[PDB]
Amino acid sequence: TSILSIVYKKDDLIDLSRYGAKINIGDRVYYDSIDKNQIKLINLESSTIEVILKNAIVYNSMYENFSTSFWIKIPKYFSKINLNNEYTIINCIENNSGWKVSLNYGEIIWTLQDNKQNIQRVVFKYSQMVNISDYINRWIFVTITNNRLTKSKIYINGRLIDQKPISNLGNIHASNKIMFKLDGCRDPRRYIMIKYFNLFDKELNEKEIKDLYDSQSNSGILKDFWGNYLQYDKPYYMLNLFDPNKYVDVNNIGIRGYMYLKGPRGSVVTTNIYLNSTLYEGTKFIIKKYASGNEDNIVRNNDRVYINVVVKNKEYRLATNASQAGVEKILSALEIPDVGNLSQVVVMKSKDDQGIRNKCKMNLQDNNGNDIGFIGFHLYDNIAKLVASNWYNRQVGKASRTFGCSWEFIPVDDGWGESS
């Protein structure tokens, strides 16, 4: 069902479909070191990704249905330069006819054109004045379904936001070449990241789209805040999803000492552009290998690892005393060589028992492989104390809503721009 599918291979970009589409890459197109499949495009002419299709797969029919799917990561807009600056990233238009993808300030634009110069547009808008966003500088699964008979729809993360009729359009003659390049942006430091771009010759339903979403999500590998791979020996700022206005903090070091959720968070402000909440507050959480047989530094599901807490630019260890009062066990930061037999091995969870993808959960375990409980927080005398309790496992078994078992890992990113 796939006609074009850009994937990575041995120092080249190829097409998985049985068409062998010619791909030309510019001399300044960059790739990541760990997830080299995803590609980055910068605001230069030489940042060129050129793909050429065959004459037998050119969109030149009159009721031909088609769809596209991709992932996009678009950074924060910092100043007033970026306002009202619709710039195209994906162009498939020849002789002023075809389909294109453009972006504005906090918008994703789907535009398709005919030979009669008719314009139909579908828009997703996301705010940038929010405290903590699920779209700013974070990977978004965007797919578009085009039904030439009824209408076209926009889908993000498998959910619908907007749809507009396209019945007025008569005939679309897309270009034989698809253009991936930032075009019409006045900001010299503006870039996007896309990955997993696929083409279809039929309007995908919600079932197929969700199937593709989870298939491409790599549920077997943990994802940090930005949606990238979570990595060993990398400092991560910690955000608790259920109470996202407090940051992990310390007061003392030892068994007596404890770690808690202190707040509220600060703010980074550029007036009338963004009023986000500071994400570089608190203590970093470095993750170290314990029994991972994999050679890479990527953290996968069911990996027993260690947790290193950076306090005053000094590394410590996450441990608890299993034998204590109550069901929840208070987390504490201990010296690495003075941990003794305290429970420190943690199991990192990516998906549920049924295999449903969810956020990051830390499952503290003892040396006997006994589940103390998922790492969370419990209030002691108006103090939010980090605890590990079986209660979260109980709600999981009862298919209830857990409260405090979900965490996000926030590394320092250039796309966020916050001063640390």
Binding site: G266, S267, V268, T271, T278
Partner: protein, 592 residues
């Protein structure tokens, strides 16, 4: 029928006077005087509490405007309700009973407010405290009058007004002695804080408790027993009066010669009583507006309303004008520094009352600075750094911040007025109110001083009025004091400094007191014993409503012009004096 009733009334009014003249004036009257003096001193204390604790409560409870205005009145509205309610109920339940109930209500809500943390709950508690102390002055005067013979009744009732002064002086002294200790931060509960002003509130609740204790040892007025058909109890109380007086005199052997006393012939269940009580009180209130008392009541209404309006207006106006003059002087002394370029320096300061305009700051570190009444205008801060910044009445207008960090600062969003921040970061913001709360320091002391001088100027007037009430007359005292109050109002033009305002406050306070004494005596003497507290309560509720209106109007005119307060006060007092000169003379008459 009605004439027969009136004849019975007049007969009882003469025999009671004869019995009281037999009993004589002595120890009983003076003991009761001191007891009811405590009750009145509570009232005197009550009207200072919120004025003295507002500067501290505004910061400690985040009080905005229209929230420090409804706490500056709430006592007057509470007393409005209380006066009417307890004065109405005192003619069906008894003077001492209703006085006990009202004082207890006042004390309870006062200790409770000493601990309340929010504003709405504090407003409610303090409203209810006002409701409780509102029935003190009607009941007290109408209770002391039912033990006095006609020989010296104005003097003995006028001596009873020293107590409101003794309460004002008490409040001022305790505010001076307690509130200035801002260090006191007693902690009981993490979310709650207990400061010095709460201690002041408790100590201000104390005299009401003492009043309850003192009153529990006094007998109900015999006249109330006689009106309501209870003959034995009235005989008992009169015998007690006579016995106490004669034992104190030095002749504890003579016998109470009165054997029979003329008495007015009387012609689920909880709610039943509640209805009957309401009906009886309403009947008494409407009978106050009867054919026999409709002219008298209307001049009393006029006199009470006009005097209260003028007195309260000017009394709240004088301290407002003093602050306004202080504010004008403070604005005159402000410093301006036009145009600056500071670069690459760690630079703290403790700057007060300044304006910086046109500055250009680059790579500046501002660690540990106190800002009081400092404004930065038309400034530019670029890669600046603010740490441990304490801000009071400090603003940034038309300012531009670029790559600046505010670490551990109280620079909230309301302190940047029409500013532009670019890539700015706020971290570890201090706890503070969402809006400006101002701050009062040394001025408190002088405030107290002023109060002490405005409730001490009243003293000569009290003394003279008490001495001369019986010799001169109620109408002459009231008129001669209202007219001189009007002349003092005219004199308000020749004062523009704080010292002049203090002297003028003392003058007006010293002048108006005799008038208010006369009016209290006159309104006790002018009503029958079965409606005295209902009438006096209605006219003392009208007084508190006039107080609210006058306070609002006269504080609305501060800093605008002096003509409005002078004209309003002089007009009101002239009309009050004119109406007072039309009232009947009650000197040398039996208490009918």
């Amino acid at each position: 029928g009605e004439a027969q009733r009136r004849k019975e009334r007049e007969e009882l009014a003469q025999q009671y006077e004869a019995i009281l003249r037999e009993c004589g004036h002595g120890r009983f009257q003076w003991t009761l005087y001191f007891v009811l003096g405590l009750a009145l001193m509570a009232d005197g204390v009550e009207v200072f509490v919120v004025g003295f604790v507002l500067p501290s409560a505004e910061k400690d409870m985040c009080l905005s405007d229209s929230n420090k205005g409804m706490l500056g009145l709430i006592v007057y509205l509470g007393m409005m309700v209380g006066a009417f309610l307890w004065g109405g109920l005192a003619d069906r339940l008894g003077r001492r009973q209703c006085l006990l109930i009202s004082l207890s209500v006042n004390s309870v809500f006062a200790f409770f407010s000493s601990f309340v943390q929010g504003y709405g709950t504090f407003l409610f508690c303090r409203l209810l405290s006002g409701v409780g102390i509102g029935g003190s002055i009607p009941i007290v005067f109408s209770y002391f009058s039912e033990f006095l013979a006609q020989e010296k009744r104005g003097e003995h009732l006028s001596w009873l007004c020293m107590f409101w002064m003794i309460g004002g002086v008490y409040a001022a002294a305790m505010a001076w002695a307690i509130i200035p200790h801002y260090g006191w931060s007693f902690q009981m509960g993490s979310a709650y804080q207990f400061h010095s002003w709460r201690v002041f509130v408790l100590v201000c609740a104390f005299p009401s408790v003492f009043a309850i204790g003192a009153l529990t040892t006094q007998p109900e007025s015999p006249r109330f027993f006689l009106e309501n058909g209870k003959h034995d109890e009235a005989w008992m109380v009169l015998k007690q009066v006579h016995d106490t007086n004669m034992r104190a005199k030095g002749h504890p052997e003579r016998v109470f010669s009165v054997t029979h006393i003329k008495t007015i012939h009387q012609e689920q269940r909880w709610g039943v009583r509640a209805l009957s009580l309401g009906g009886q009180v309403w009947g008494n209130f409407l009978s106050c507006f009867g054919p026999e008392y409709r002219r008298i009541t209307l001049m009393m209404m006029g006199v009470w309303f006009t005097m209260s309006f003028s007195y309260y207006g000017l009394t709240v106006w004088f301290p407002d004008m003093i602050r306004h003059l202080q504010a004008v002087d403070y604005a005159s002394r402000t410093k301006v520094f036009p145009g600056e370029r500071v670069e690459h320096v760690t630079f703290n300061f403790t700057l007060e009352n300044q304006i910086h305009r046109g500055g250009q700051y680059f790579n500046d570190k501002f660690i540990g600075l106190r800002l009081k009444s400092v404004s930065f205008e038309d400034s530019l801060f670029e890669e600046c750094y603010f740490e441990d910044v304490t801000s009071s009445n400090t603003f940034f207008r038309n300012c531009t911040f670029i790559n600046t960090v505010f670490y551990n600062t109280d620079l909230f969003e309301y302190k940047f007025v029409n500013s532009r921040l670019i890539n700015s970061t706020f971290l570890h913001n201090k706890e503070g109110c969402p809006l400006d709360v101002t701050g009062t320091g040394e001025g408190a002391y002088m405030v107290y001083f002023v109060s002490f001088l405005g409730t001490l100027a009243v003293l000569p007037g009290n003394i003279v009025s008490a001495l001369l009430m019986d010799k001169i007359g109620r109408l002459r005292m009231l008129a001669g004091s209202s007219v001189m109050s009007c002349v003092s109002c005219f004199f308000l033009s020749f004062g523009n400094s704080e010292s002049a305002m203090i002297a003028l406050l003392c003058l007006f306070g010293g002048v108006s007191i005799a008038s208010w004494n006369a009016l209290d005596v006159l309104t006790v003497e002018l009503y029958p014993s079965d409606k005295r507290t209902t009438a006096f309560g209605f006219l003392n509720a009208l007084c508190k409503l006039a107080a609210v209106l006058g306070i609002s109007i006269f504080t609305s005119f501060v800093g605008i012009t002096k003509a409005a307060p002078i004209l309003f006060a002089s007009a009101a007092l002239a009309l009050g004096s004119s109406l007072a000169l039309k009232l009947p003379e009650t000197r040398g008459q039996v208490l009918q």
